From Swiss-Prot, chain A:
It comes from Thermus thermophilus (strain ATCC BAA-163 / DSM 7039 / HB27). One of the early assembly proteins it binds 23S rRNA. One of the proteins that surrounds the polypeptide exit tunnel on the outside of the ribosome. Forms the main docking site for trigger factor binding to the ribosome. GO terms for molecular function: rRNA binding; structural constituent of ribosome. It comes from the Bacteria. One of its GO terms (biological process) is translation. Part of the 50S ribosomal subunit. Contacts protein L29, and trigger factor when it is bound to the ribosome. SUPFAM superfamilies: Ribosomal proteins S24e, L23 and L15e. The lineage of its organism: Bacteria, Thermotogati, Deinococcota, Deinococci, Thermales. GO terms for cellular component: ribonucleoprotein complex; ribosome. Belongs to the universal ribosomal protein uL23 family. Keywords: Ribonucleoprotein, Ribosomal protein, RNA-binding, rRNA-binding. HAMAP family: Ribosomal_uL23_B. The keyword Hydrolase does not apply. This is Large ribosomal subunit protein uL23.
UniProtKB/Swiss-Prot annotation, chain B:
One of its GO terms (biological process) is translation. InterPro entries: Ribosomal_protein_uL29, Ribosomal_uL29, Ribosomal_uL29_CS, Ribosomal_uL29_sf. One of its GO terms (cellular component) is cytosolic large ribosomal subunit. This is Large ribosomal subunit protein uL29. Belongs to the universal ribosomal protein uL29 family. It comes from Thermus thermophilus (strain ATCC BAA-163 / DSM 7039 / HB27). CDD domains: Ribosomal_L29_HIP. One of its GO terms (molecular function) is structural constituent of ribosome. It comes from the Bacteria. Keywords: Ribonucleoprotein, Ribosomal protein. The keyword Phosphoprotein does not apply.
UniProtKB/Swiss-Prot annotation, chain C:
NCBIfam families: L28. It comes from the Bacteria. The gene is rpmB. This is Large ribosomal subunit protein bL28. Belongs to the bacterial ribosomal protein bL28 family.
UniProtKB/Swiss-Prot annotation, chain D:
One of two assembly initiator proteins, it binds directly to the 5'-end of the 23S rRNA, where it nucleates assembly of the 50S subunit. One of the proteins that surrounds the polypeptide exit tunnel on the outside of the subunit. One of its GO terms (molecular function) is rRNA binding. The gene is rplX. CDD domains: KOW_RPL26. It comes from Thermus thermophilus (strain ATCC BAA-163 / DSM 7039 / HB27). This is Large ribosomal subunit protein uL24. GO terms for biological process: translation.
Length: 92, 62, 88, 100
RNA sequence: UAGCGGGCGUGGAUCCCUGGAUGUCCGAAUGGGGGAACCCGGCCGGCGGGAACGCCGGUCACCGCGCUUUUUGCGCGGGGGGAACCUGGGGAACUGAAACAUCUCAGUACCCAGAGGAGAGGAAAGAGAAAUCGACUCCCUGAGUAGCGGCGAGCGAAAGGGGACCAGCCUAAACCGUCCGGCUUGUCCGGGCGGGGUCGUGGGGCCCUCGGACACCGAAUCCCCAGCCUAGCCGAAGCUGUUGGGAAGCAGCGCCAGAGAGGGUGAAAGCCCCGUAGGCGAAAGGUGGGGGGAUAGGUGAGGGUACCCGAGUACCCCGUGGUUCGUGGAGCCAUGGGGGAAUCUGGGCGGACCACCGCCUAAGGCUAAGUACUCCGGGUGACCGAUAGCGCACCAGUACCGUGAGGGAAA
RNA sequence: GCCGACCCGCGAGGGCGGCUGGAGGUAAGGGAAGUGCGAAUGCCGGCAUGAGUAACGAUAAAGAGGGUGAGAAUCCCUCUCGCCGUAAGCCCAAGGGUUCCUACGCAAUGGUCGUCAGCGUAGGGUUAGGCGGGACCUAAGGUGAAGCCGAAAGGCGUAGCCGAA
RNA sequence: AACCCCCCGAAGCCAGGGAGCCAAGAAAAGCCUCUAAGCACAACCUGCGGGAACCCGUACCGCAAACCGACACAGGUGGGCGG
């Protein structure tokens, strides 16, 4: 288990602008050490990460009819790949 | 019917068993990620592939 | 408390004050009251070390009688409380 | 479980009402609501469509579901109840006094 | 739970029943901390370049008992929850008495600890007047009797008779062997284990005599099985007219019935669907003396010897509770305080005491069933039919109201 | 259920005729009860009266042109005016927890209006070895090995541990 | 783009400064030093190098229409800046 840490690529102009730099970012398992992220994404993209940052995102609250609702919580993660490489998959 | 199929493949996955188990699972795990990875972008996702690949991993892990 | 060879939990019971003559009539005035067992501490040598006893006054000799049974036993090496247990 | 009922997907007569006596192959059988689709009860839907995709949907008068009790199976002889006979191995079903 | 979108199924899916696997973090929560669902570690092994970092799997709380000679370890158990019921330890007041204080409410409410499909109680140191009955528990009755009671309000048995159920057992002591350690070294003291022993026509021990062995008794423990619950299957008998939006209504001519209970189908159906009568079914898991089998354990006589028969106990007095019993002439069962024996020429009891006559063997433990309850499943109802009925027929202990116990709708 | 001037009964009631309604109803004769409401400052819900009345929550204050728009005293912009300035500005904590930002939109919320918003639907947004807190310490206090006590539940309590603006 | 002179001046800084007075003014670790067990082929101090460095909060309001007052309530709420 190690592809389970990386969830999915974040799709935002803020995330995209990171591609211009050496900073690919994406969703991650809630309980996940920045260090284990390093090792997860490192061996999942054949690249070498240098600097990882992390955020918690309180899932906004939606609702339907007279019924209250609560979206799940997620963990943003922004990685700084070594100066001289890229993720062609994330580029897309 | 795909059950009877993959099942025998697992006792067949006894060349190396625990080793090929982890190997094969790690592979399908990657494929699973590659799947939802392309699924989120939209223009590379159908549907049934996921739940089939998920439960696929399951029995393999069994 | 009361735990020991005695085993006598203190019980409560009525303590009625009466007024009367006895061979003429008799009346009263009631209230509850806790009766404690007369119980005393009993220190004793017993092999190595010393050892006490929060025992009752009734079964005082019972302890010393039991101390005799203890001679026919093998005990040693730091055994303050443990002695009591193995001590019947 | 036990949701099973009379016939399945085949030839069936209808003693319902607006389409009494009629006959046709039952193309569908929804057990949840306990009703089957034949060729009798067919009402006109005016609606364009619930989903915006595919602009035209159809003022179609397609087949409406029908209570699975008003329909009765059939064979060489018209309209018959259903008996069952465990085969020399399996479990087939014979009609009133004939096979299948 | 439709829709966008994409699939599986006679190579037998979806579903139902049984077993198994995975099962994050909290919670008895148990490696440590903690503001429950969070934070931080020690030990072994793995992963990433991997020594700092991080992750993964295994493991480390405490208390009880036996083993461990010691220290340390090893094993077994405990902890927490449960609608009501059950036992034990504690335990009110309003109210009644038309005031109130003894009484009553009541050993109720509540608190607490424990137990399990039950709990408790239980093989007489019994009852009580019959030279009688024969463990215990529950239902009739006895009986609103006997009695209790500021003889006020009120409280309220037992024996006996009739029923359900039926069950009887192990041990302590004398005495023999044995292992251990202690000393005042002995023909012993004590502890552990084994044998022996369990009674009220009194029983047992030791010695002698009997021939004293084959059978006789037989589990509450164990083994197999019947049966039963946990999915299910079979299952008789109708067609056309007629009114209508719709036949099952009305008509005509038939049929079944070990099935004419009930539900549904466009309305009013035995014969259309589901069923009902009747009868089938278990690989697996749960139950099971109902049946059978084995094992534990158990069985006799006479004479002598007088060894043993459960201790701070019986017993007596002071203080009290229980009983119908409020000190009453007050016994009996239990016992906080003080004094304090004996082993069958023993000891309790039969309502103060004595005597006679008679019942019974205390101070060790276990025992099914008959009985209580209903969270859960099923059946039924001169029970409700949305202001009724559970607070809740509807995503309710919710929204909303409270710091909090807690309160609590409408629909 | 709505209406009747009709028939029966002293009456409580029953019967008939029209209208609605769309599926249950239960003679004669008997049985059993959650059996009849106008009042309880009765309980629940619905609707009236005051009444188009009082009040729109600080007397710091508005005017005009243009624009958007189905529709603007109330939304945007410009100009002129007025108000605060140890505040009516600015930074942090507590508390609140998505109200921040950006599209589309106005039924209700806003004490009027609304194209606007702290409102509805959707998307997006919070990046730390150095700031704050924890892998640091201790205070009151809590806790609690040992130890003491208490019918049970439990109460003290050294070391240690927890505990900070 | 200039970015340089003169002046006022803190309650803030050097801070454990000093003086006086009586009511007499926390604790533990970090840190320095000393020796025990142990070890002294270690360990520790310093210098340079490479490498490693996690968990939680960061939006927004914040004297108020977002917090406590059932309300966009003339009420209440601590610290700093306040020309
Ligand atoms: Mg962070
Ligand atoms: Mg004495
Ligand atoms: Mg779904
Ligand atoms: Mg050893
Ligand atoms: Mg009173
Ligand atoms: Mg009074
Ligand atoms: Mg009483
Ligand atoms: Mg029992
Ligand atoms: Mg009975
Ligand atoms: Mg009685
Ligand atoms: Mg009474
Ligand atoms: Mg024995
Ligand atoms: Mg024996
Ligand atoms: Mg008495
Ligand atoms: Mg006594
Ligand atoms: Mg006995
Ligand atoms: Mg029992
Ligand atoms: Mg009714
Ligand atoms: Mg509130
Ligand atoms: Mg007026
Ligand atoms: Mg006015
Ligand atoms: Mg206009
Ligand atoms: Mg509006
Ligand atoms: Mg408005
Ligand atoms: Mg508009
Ligand atoms: Mg302290
Ligand atoms: Mg404490
Ligand atoms: Mg302390
Ligand atoms: Mg601390
Ligand atoms: Mg701090
Ligand atoms: Mg200042
Ligand atoms: Mg002075
Ligand atoms: Mg030194
Ligand atoms: Mg920020
Ligand atoms: Mg205000
Ligand atoms: Mg306002
Ligand atoms: Mg102030
Ligand atoms: Mg100033």
């Amino acid at each position: 288990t190690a592809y389970d840490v990386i969830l999915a690529p974040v799709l935002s102009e803020k995330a995209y602008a990171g591609f211009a730099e050496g900073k690919y970012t994406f969703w991650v398992h809630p309980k996940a050490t920045k260090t284990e992220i390093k090792n997860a994404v490192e061996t999942a993209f054949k690249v070498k990460v240098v600097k990882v940052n992390t955020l918690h995102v309180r899932g906004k609250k939606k609702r339907l009819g007279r019924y209250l609702g609560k979206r799940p919580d997620r963990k943003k993660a922004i990685v700084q790949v070594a100066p001289g490489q890229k993720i062609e998959a994330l580029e897309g | 019917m795909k059950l009877s199929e993959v099942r025998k493949q697992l006792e067949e996955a006894r060349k190396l068993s625990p080793v090929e188990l982890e190997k094969l699972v790690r592979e399908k795990k990657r494929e699973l990620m590659e799947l939802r990875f392309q699924a989120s972008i939209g223009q590379l996702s159908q549907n049934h592939k996921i739940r089939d690949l998920k439960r696929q991993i399951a029995r393999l892990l069994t | 408390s009361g735990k020991r060879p005695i085993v006598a939990n203190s019980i409560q019971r009525r303590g009625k004050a009466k007024r009367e003559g006895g061979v003429g009539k008799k009346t009263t005035g009631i209230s509850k009251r806790r009766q404690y067992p007369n119980l005393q501490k009993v220190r004793v040598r017993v092999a190595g070390q010393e050892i006490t006893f929060r025992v009752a006054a009734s079964h005082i000799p019972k302890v010393y009688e039991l101390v005799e049974r203890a001679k026919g036993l093998r005990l040693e090496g730091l055994s303050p409380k443990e002695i009591k247990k193995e001590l019947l | 479980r036990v949701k099973m009922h009379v016939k399945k997907g085949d030839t069936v007569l209808v003693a319902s009402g607006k389409y009494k006596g009629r006959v046709g192959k039952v193309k569908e059988v929804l057990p949840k609501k306990y009703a089957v689709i034949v060729e009798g009860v067919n009402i006109v839907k005016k609606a364009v469509r619930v989903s915006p995709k595919y602009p035209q949907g159809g003022f179609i008068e397609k087949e409406a579901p029908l209570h699975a009790s008003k329909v009765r199976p059939i064979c060489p002889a018209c309209g018959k109840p259903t008996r069952v006979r465990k085969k020399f191995l399996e479990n087939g079903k014979k009609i009133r006094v004939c096979a299948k």
